[PDB]
Design a protein around this ligand. Structure first.
Ligand SMILES: O=C(O)C(=O)Cc1ccccc1
Length: 361
């Protein structure tokens, strides 16, 4: 039969600013790959791990999809690892935490990940923060594996880089207030504050810090790299800096940059499918995942027919061989033990300047 791709995304819930762009990207994906028809099955998981697991089981057991893609967020994606592995179906996760694919194990052998691992980003932003002369850095982040991935790496790096983390405050994504946490951070009198958050929930702690009088540097993560964050945040997020993807800095690169080229492809296709509307970065996590899948399909078709475990296993084998590939997410080199594919060369420092994401250095 035709090739079938299943996708679960957080199109509603606190992940909406990530999942909605992904949902709108589906219509831009190719109807034929390697001379074979392709059908997409996309489901909203509502930013809920239980619903994502239900979606995956439905796509795997009922549609027998050849590849599963999702989810948008780390906590939502975690349970999909075991589900995809048990089904011997490759999973292209669209979330960010390193734990989604590293260290390698017998289940993560089935998982690939186009967003650069957060530990790479945390090391990069930590080095930058140190170079500014900051010695005391406050911290607030999500009380989940995404936030904690930033905290643990920054906390380990701190003494080696010459600063100290003054707090370890957390919040849940939908929380109405972080006032208690922010007051605690402010009371430590830090030079700067790090926020580990994603989507529109990332605005709250930054606005709260500014409203409570904090005037120092505020650092965020690539979870904020959507123009929706700039729009909601306004003057309060001006000057935010984070380590992120080539996509976000593409306009401040040479004309022949491969990153401009791969971005143009995506933007043009997205606009054509969405009435001329421009995408935010999160849609590109679906797009780049499909780049890996599309590249693997011709060899897989030589091995087996779609809808068979052999075809899925062939896709898994082929993606692992991907080398020297410019994605919107960076320069990707897969290996048997690294299903992310990036090193520090793909960590770009991005700043919000005059209401736009800009390549900072
Ligand atoms: O919120 C999460 O759990 C994430 O994994 C956030 C994220 C996802 C994709 C790119 C950057 C951040």
């Amino acid at each position: 039969a035709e090739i079938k791709i299943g996708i679960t995304m957080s199109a509603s819930g606190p992940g909406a600013a990530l999942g909605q762009p992904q949902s709108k990207t589906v219509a831009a994906l190719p109807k034929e790959i390697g001379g074979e028809k392709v059908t997409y099955f996309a489901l909203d998981d509502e930013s809920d791990p239980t619903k994502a697991a239900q979606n995956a089981r439905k796509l795997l057991s009922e549609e027998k999809v050849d590849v599963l893609i999702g989810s948008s967020l780390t906590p939502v994606s975690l349970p999909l690892i075991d589900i995809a592995a048990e089904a011997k179906t490759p999973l292209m996760t669209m979330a960010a935490a390193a734990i989604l694919v590293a260290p390698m194990d017998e289940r993560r052998k089935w998982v690939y990940k186009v967003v650069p691992n957060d530990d790479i980003m945390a090391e990069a932003i930590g080095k930058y923060i140190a170079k500014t002369g900051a010695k005391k850095v406050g911290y607030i982040g999500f009380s989940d594996a995404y936030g904690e991935g930033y905290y643990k790496v920054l906390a380990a790096a701190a003494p080696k880089l010459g600063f100290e983390l003054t707090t370890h405050e957390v919040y849940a994504r939908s929380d109405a207030s972080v006032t208690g946490q922010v007051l605690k951070i402010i009371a430590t009198k830090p030079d700067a504050v790090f926020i580990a958050s994603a989507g529109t929930p990332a605005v709250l702690p930054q606005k709260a810090l500014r409203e409570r009088g904090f005037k120092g540097a505020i650092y965020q993560t690539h979870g904020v790299a959507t123009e929706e964050f700039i729009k909601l945040g306004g003057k309060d997020v001006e000057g935010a800096i984070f380590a992120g993807e080539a996509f976000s800095g593409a306009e401040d690169m040479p004309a022949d940059s491969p990153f401009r080229k791969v971005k143009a492809r995506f933007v043009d296709a997205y606009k054509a499918a969405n009435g001329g509307a421009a995408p935010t970065i999160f849609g590109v996590h679906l797009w780049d995942s499909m780049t890996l899948v599309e590249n693997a399909i011709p060899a897989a078709l030589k091995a087996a027919k779609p809808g068979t475990p052999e075809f899925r296993a062939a896709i898994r084998d082929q993606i692992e061989k991907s080398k020297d590939l410019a994605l919107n997410n960076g320069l990707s080199n897969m290996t048997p033990d690294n299903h992310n594919g990036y090193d520090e060369r793909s960590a770009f420092l991005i700043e919000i300047r005059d209401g736009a994401f800009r390549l900072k250095q």
